[PDB]
Design a protein around this ligand. Structure first.
Ligand SMILES: [Mg+2]
Ligand SMILES: [Zn+2]
Ligand SMILES: [Zn+2]
Lengths: 91, 214, 137, 102, 64, 201, 103
RNA sequence: GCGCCGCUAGAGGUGAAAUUCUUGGACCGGCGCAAGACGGACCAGAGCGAAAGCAUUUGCCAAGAAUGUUUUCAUUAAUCAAGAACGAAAGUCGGAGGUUCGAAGACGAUCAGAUACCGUCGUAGUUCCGACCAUAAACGAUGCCGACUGGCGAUGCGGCGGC
């Protein structure tokens, strides 16, 4: 059914911690708990291990990505910025 | 107290032997003070020199760049670095009610001299034309532009730097993109606007002293 | 002799001359043909003592008188000219010290080569310092 | 009272033209409101031409042009006097003034 | 600095100036040739056909 | 006690028949079963480690040897990167830019792995309760319950004591203050609520 | 990424209707050894020793390989139904022109 | 902005003037580089979009107006309470990034007084990403749909025919 209107994942804290510190966790905490799509075997089994580490359910290939997510917004830029220096000047 | 201009000397800079006039001018440089030796204290001087002081007949509104690469004592030699048009031409041929088309391309030679070519062109109000808005459609713009970069890729990808740099003193590339576009839309003031150098291949002195021969 | 380049009299030597005619000052910076080696940078704000008159047409006049007396003394005889404006984000009209700088340099003993307006031009670059309603004098 | 039929701005079928910035006072106006002016004045200030040909090393040297487009706000168009206060039945005309080169 | 004083005959007068009617412009010639002429401005009565003595010879033409 | 993970990159030993194992700061994007190359001519991809003299300017560099041959010291934390600007191939002294922002002129033989460090963005979740801050600093040190020095006796802190909770003496002390007096703002150039970001070299 | 991949994928939905085609790894291995395969297609994301032996048996049987620009959940929908698929082979194009195309 | 050389003592800014940057060498000139904004001149009483709005080239798509049609179904239609969608800027929340301009703020000028105009430095903001807010002189100050009622010269898109 519909069980809430404005908490979602942070209903487990309840009446505690405030309302702009449970608004802050609910974007990080659905992000760290979701199952991301594997860029190596197509499936969605990227279950987050300890912080930094990410790991497939199947094909068993462990990627060290973001901390609360999989792809850091800066590290998406960097991998597409390293290869910019790799073809310009050829080094 | 001390004059710091008598501690200088005066070399002279020479154009490549692919032209007519060789005496560019006399640049000046301080002499050797211990660690600072003045040989490579000028290797890399770019000279804002036009064509009518580097040809005899050719137009005045086009200029070359000519970095300095090595020093033979007083005579100091250069190599082609780039070109561009003078600014008084480039915004006199920009008028209202005619669409400028432009194309740019990174095409390397067969010499390890990756070039970047810039070209412009302006549509042509005809003789008996009565209307004033002589514009081109959008699909005519794209396919002239594909035709423009097709031609300068035939002129630069095929053979090395020297026949390329020899190609644009009479500007055969701009005349050829003139002729092969006017079946789509006629053009009239169609130039290679700017050439930019992107790479440098390991710096021999053999290729320097062949370009400074006859 | 040691100073000066060595040429004949029927020939001459070229060194370009940055006439930077912005507003509220004037530069008559001379250099060689490389663009690099500065010969003389005297300034219309240095040869008048007013600060109303840093860009005055009289100021660039006698600045140009001094720089030719320095140019012709060092040995360089003929100039190219590379006049500018304020450039780019700000205004693009060259100030009062343009033609008061060049005719004074012309009348006071100098040969003149290719002259050129080589001021900067952007492609809708940056955002200009006035605010949206502009400076309201 | 609607003063002008087009409302100063010569747009018809749009919602937003690109706002450009005035040339002396740097005020933000739309592109088709702005009082345009294009100046092809000679750089040499043509009183000063037969004072440089004695100094010129060349004999037939084409003196370069100078290409500035001034684009104004309407407030610094009147005060710097490129436009002018007019009359009722002589507002509805889109013609430029006469040239008269000398 | 050291430029000799140049004497000058006027051609056609361009009228009063300075906003009080105290000054005039003569468009003098330099008493050397028929050509090298500058349009200057004096104060006082002109009477076309005189010789007046410019203490320098390179200033300006009036334009605002 | 660390947020950034570690890779363990086994290498073949070119001096005896063996395989030996390292532990690197994991630059972000790597995964198991990836060939990480290392040397002077290692091609400039992510995860590779190669001296800063050969890489071009403006690239993004983590976990560098501050002094050559050190084996990795600068910018090792989770989600950090130093940036090399302005090579100078004579005197072999280039410079980089640390994550603190104080750019540093270093040696040009500093072997230094390419990329940003995995585990980054960790300080953007609130700890949010005292238990996850207990567990954060139970595995690092014994430093987590920090008692305010105003809230203890004069025999135990230079600020404590008095019939209120006040400080009395100004909280900015000089740098050669004796050991046991350097409490509070140690040698502060300025104090108070910072307008701006840094605005000084 | 703008106009003209209306060659490679729109041909592939035509062979979804008309011609005969086998999917996956161990079916497209059983048609490539006994000759009946005509053009194998590898996804981008099949593992590399799987990529380098379907390439190898195609070198033995002297057939063609078209590597695909896309994920196996991007090739899988480009075929036109919902399962992910790495490697497919066509054994007859009905009335498309895959073999007469660019490879 | 930052390197690296060159020269010299002011540069800056104003109706003037100063706060400011300056021989631990600035402004200027030259070669380089990096970052992040931005798409001039071509640009018009031109086009597209329901509106907001929309401009560097090349690259998956998905769509649309109109024209052309001896195509097909044959009233399937117009406006539309309740109800939803998209909605400039500014704003608020979270993360990247921070060049430039720059609310607030500081300081200098101007003034009887300047918490204003002018000057310098400058925070939030601009800039991207994901979530919200639903307002504007959101103006053709004209709801949409249908017909009929003058002319002329054009500009834009098709289609047909012509020296
Ligand atoms: Mg506490
Ligand atoms: Zn997986
Ligand atoms: Zn204005």
């Amino acid at each position: 059914a519909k069980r809430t209107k404005k908490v979602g994942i942070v209903g487990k804290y309840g009446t505690r911690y405030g309302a702009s510190l449970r608004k802050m966790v609910k974007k990080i905490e659905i992000s760290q708990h979701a199952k991301y799509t594997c860029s190596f075997c197509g499936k969605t089994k990227m279950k987050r291990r300890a912080v930094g580490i990410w790991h497939c359910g199947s094909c068993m290939k462990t990627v060290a990505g973001g901390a609360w997510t999989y792809n850091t917004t800066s590290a998406v830029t960097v991998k597409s910025a390293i290869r910019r220096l790799k073809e310009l000047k050829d080094q | 107290v001390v004059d710091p201009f008598s501690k200088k000397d005066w070399y002279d800079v020479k154009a490549p032997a692919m032209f007519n006039i060789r005496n560019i001018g006399k640049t000046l440089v301080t002499r050797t003070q211990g660690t600072k030796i003045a040989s490579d204290g000028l290797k890399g001087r770019v000279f804002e020199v036009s064509l009518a002081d580097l040809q005899n007949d050719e137009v005045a509104f086009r200029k070359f760049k000519l970095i300095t690469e090595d020093v033979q004592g007083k005579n100091c030699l250069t190599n082609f670095h780039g070109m561009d048009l003078t600014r008084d031409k480039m915004c006199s041929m920009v008028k209202k009610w005619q669409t400028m088309i432009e194309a740019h391309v990174d095409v390397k030679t067969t010499d390890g001299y990756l070039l970047r070519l810039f070209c412009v062109g302006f549509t042509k109000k005809r003789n008996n034309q009565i209307r004033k808005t002589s514009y081109a459609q959008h699909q005519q713009v794209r396919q002239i532009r594909k035709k423009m970069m097709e031609i300068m890729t035939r002129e630069v990808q095929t053979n090395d730097l020297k026949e390329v740099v020899n190609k644009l003193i009479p500007d055969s590339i701009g005349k050829d993109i003139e002729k092969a576009c006017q079946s789509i839309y006629p053009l009239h003031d169609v130039f290679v606007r700017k050439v930019k150098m992107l790479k440098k291949p390991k710096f021999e002195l053999g290729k320097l002293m062949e370009l400074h021969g006859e | 002799i040691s100073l000066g380049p060595q040429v004949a009299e029927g020939e001459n030597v070229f060194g370009v001359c940055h006439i930077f005619a912005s507003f509220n000052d004037t530069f008559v910076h001379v250099t060689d043909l490389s663009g690099k080696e500065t010969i003389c940078r005297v300034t219309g704000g240095m040869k008048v003592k007013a600060d109303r008159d840093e860009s005055s047409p009289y100021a660039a006049m006698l600045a140009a008188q001094d720089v030719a007396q320095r140019c012709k003394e060092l040995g360089i005889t003929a100039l190219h000219i590379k006049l500018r404006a304020t450039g780019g984000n700000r205004t693009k009209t060259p100030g009062p010290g343009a033609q008061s700088a060049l005719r004074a340099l012309a009348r006071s003993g100098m040969k003149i080569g290719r002259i050129e307006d080589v001021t900067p031009i952007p492609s809708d670059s940056t955002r200009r310092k006035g605010g949206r309603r502009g400076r309201r004098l | 009272t609607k003063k002008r039929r087009n409302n100063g701005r010569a747009k018809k079928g749009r919602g937003h033209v690109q706002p450009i910035r005035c040339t002396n006072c740097a005020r933000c106006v739309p592109k088709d409101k702005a009082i345009k002016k294009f100046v092809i004045r000679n750089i040499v200030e043509a009183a000063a031409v037969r004072d440089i040909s004695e100094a010129s090393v060349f004999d037939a040297y084409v003196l370069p042009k100078l290409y500035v487009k001034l684009h104004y706000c309407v407030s610094c168009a009147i005060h710097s006097k490129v436009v002018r206060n007019r009359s009722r039945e002589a507002r509805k005309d889109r013609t430029p003034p006469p040239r008269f080169r000398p | 600095r050291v430029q000799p004083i140049k004497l000058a005959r006027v051609t056609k007068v361009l009228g009063r100036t300075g906003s009080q009617g105290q000054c005039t412009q003569v468009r003098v010639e330099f008493m050397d040739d028929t050509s090298r002429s500058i349009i200057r401005n004096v104060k006082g009565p002109v009477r076309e056909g005189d010789v007046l003595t410019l203490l320098e010879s390179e200033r300006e033409a009036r334009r605002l | 006690g660390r947020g950034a993970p570690l890779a363990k990159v086994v290498f073949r030993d070119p001096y005896r028949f063996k395989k030996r194992t390292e532990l690197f700061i994991a630059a972000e994007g790597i995964h198991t079963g990836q060939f990480v190359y290392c040397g002077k001519k290692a091609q400039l991809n992510i995860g590779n480690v190669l001296p800063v003299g050969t890489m071009p300017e403006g690239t993004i560099v983590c976990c560098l040897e501050e002094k050559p041959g050190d084996r990795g010291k600068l910018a090792r934390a989770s989600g950090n990167y130093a940036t090399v600007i302005s090579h100078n191939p004579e005197t072999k002294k280039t410079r980089v830019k640390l994550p603190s922002g104080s750019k540093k002129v270093i040696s040009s033989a500093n072997r230094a792995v390419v990329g940003v460090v995995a585990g980054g963005g960790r300080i953007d979740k609130p700890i949010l309760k005292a238990g996850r801050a207990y567990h954060k600093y139970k595995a690092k040190r014994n430093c987590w319950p920090r008692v305010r020095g105003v809230a203890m006796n004069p025999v135990e802190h230079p600020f404590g004591g008095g019939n209120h909770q006040h400080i009395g003496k100004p909280s900015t002390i000089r740098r050669d203050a004796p050991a046991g007096r350097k409490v509070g703002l140690i040698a502060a150039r300025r104090t108070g609520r910072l307008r701006g970001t840094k605005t000084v070299q | 990424t703008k106009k003209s991949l209306e060659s490679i994928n729109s041909r592939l939905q035509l062979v979804m209707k008309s011609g005969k085609y086998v999917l996956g790894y161990k079916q497209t291995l059983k048609m490539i050894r006994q000759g009946k395969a005509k053009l194998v297609i590898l996804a981008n994301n099949c593992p590399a020793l799987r990529k380098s032996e379907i390439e190898y048996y195609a070198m033995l049987a002297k057939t063609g390989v078209h590597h695909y620009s896309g994920n196996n959940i991007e090739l899988g929908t480009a075929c036109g139904k919902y399962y992910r698929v790495c490697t497919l082979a066509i054994i007859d194009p009905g009335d498309s022109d895959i073999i007469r195309s660019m490879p």
